[PDB]
């Protein structure tokens, strides 16, 4: 297992118990695959600079974690699954590079 950052945006017009059921789906799925968080984050709801999802805003979730490498593709698909997943994006876990120092 390696680690990538899970950046994924999910519908705006959501709500309570919904946030509940699909985000948790997020969960157990993840695990079922081989996911298990390292950074449970997200910055809540936010707008964008281009009306995607037929909307000007949505909810964005970010959790970076450990997983079984290749499974990535797999769960990914499992995710986009759930309609609302306005954007399903995973990236290899790097972060260094100070430009202008």
């Amino acid at each position: 297992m390696r680690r990538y950052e899970v950046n994924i945006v999910l519908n705006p017009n959501l709500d309570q118990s919904q946030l509940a059921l699909e985000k948790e789906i997020i969960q157990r799925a993840l695990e079922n695959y081989g996911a298990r968080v390292e950074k449970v984050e997200e910055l809540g709801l936010r707008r964008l600079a281009y009306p995607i999802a037929k909307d000007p805003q949505g909810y964005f979730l970010w959790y970076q974690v450990e997983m079984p490498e290749d499974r990535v593709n797999d769960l990914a698909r499992e995710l986009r699954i759930r309609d609302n997943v306005r954007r399903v994006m995973v990236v290899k876990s790097q972060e260094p590079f100070l430009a202008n120092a």
Binding site: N7, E95, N100
Partner: peptide, 15 residues
């Protein structure tokens, strides 16, 4: 602009 912001990590997206 190279001097608009200093020490900036290119390793991002949420900026």
């Amino acid at each position: 602009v190279k001097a608009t912001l200093g020490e900036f990590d290119l390793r991002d997206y949420r900026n």
